[PDB]
Design a protein around this ligand. Structure first.
Ligand SMILES: [Ca+2]
Length: 297
């Protein structure tokens, strides 16, 4: 049954993009406004951090070595051993204050990531300034659609025929038909509408039974969704309100890791939630997730 542990009380300003790296038994994650990519060794319990030159919104495995990440509005290759970033491509060059937000590699090794206008005062942002992109293995960029408010959680169905996507200010999880061979998406439709208490949908991952787990920012929970029926199958409440994202990890992807944010917490909120910004592990969910895909460029 379910057991929750703050495995690393990291106090992240905005912990995000959890990715399990099974070859090192470590969790990768970012702290967006601190400009850090982080690696927590689940055995030694120690964490490495590398600091970039702009906010870093997501990180992913790169098959040929090291990592890729979204830094500002740039797709970058990250040499972990040299702590250096090399720009692979740039987007939104016409925007005053945009950044990438959530991103993830697709089943063919393409790095999907979308953008947003940056906050200019806690929860104040310019509307519809973002777009969803993907970085292909030869480094060219495809733009799928614009008018995005806050590009957020995303994953693919296990048969690799459906792409799931969250624009947070739609309070909806959407699905697209997805073509593995071309990376094309189409036929956008809502598969789940969040309830008031579920607040803002943030990050998302799929499980090995094809169900989606969505982190609810300000909702202090992850919710499990059936995209076929639109039914919420389960709610798992966490001891912190600002739950931001989730992934599966640990042995055979049997554990869930949940990131969260300390930014925007009043000091009274911090006394009630001293572990705000920490990394939480949930065991006993009774379902496994799947391995992350690795970027092919
Ligand atoms: Ca997010």
């Amino acid at each position: 049954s379910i057991k929750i542990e703050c495995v690393l009380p990291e106090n992240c300003r905005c912990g995000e993009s959890p990715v399990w790296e099974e070859v090192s038994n470590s969790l990768l994650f970012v702290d967006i406004p601190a400009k850090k990519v982080c690696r927590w060794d689940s055995f030694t319990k120690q964490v490495q951090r590398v600091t970039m030159d702009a906010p870093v919104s997501s990180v992913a495995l790169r098959q040929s070595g090291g990592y890729v990440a979204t830094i500002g509005t740039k797709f970058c290759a990250l040499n972990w051993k040299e702590q250096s970033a090399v720009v692979l491509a740039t987007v939104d060059n016409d925007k005053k204050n945009n950044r990438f937000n959530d991103g993830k590699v697709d089943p063919a090794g393409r790095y999907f990531a979308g953008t947003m206008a940056e906050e200019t005062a806690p929860a104040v942002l310019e509307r519809h300034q973002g777009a969803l992109y993907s970085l292909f293995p030869d480094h060219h960029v495809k733009k799928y659609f614009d008018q995005v408010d806050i590009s957020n959680g995303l994953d693919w169905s296990l048969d690799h025929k459906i792409f799931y996507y969250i624009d947070s200010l739609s309070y909806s999880v959407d699905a697209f038909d997805y073509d593995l061979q071309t990376g094309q998406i189409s036929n956008r439709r809502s598969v789940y509408k969040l309830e008031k208490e579920e607040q803002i949908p943030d990050g998302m991952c799929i499980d090995a039974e094809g169900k989606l787990w969505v982190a609810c920012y300000n909702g202090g929970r992850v919710i499990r969704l059936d995209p076929v029926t639109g039914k919420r199958l389960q709610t798992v409440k966490l001891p912190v309100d600002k739950t931001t994202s989730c992934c599966f990890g640990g042995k055979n992807y049997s554990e869930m890791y949940v990131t969260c944010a300390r930014d925007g917490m009043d000091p009274e909120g911090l006394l009630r939630q001293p572990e705000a910004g920490g990394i939480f592990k949930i065991t006993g969910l009774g379902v496994k997730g799947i391995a992350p895909y690795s970027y092919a460029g």
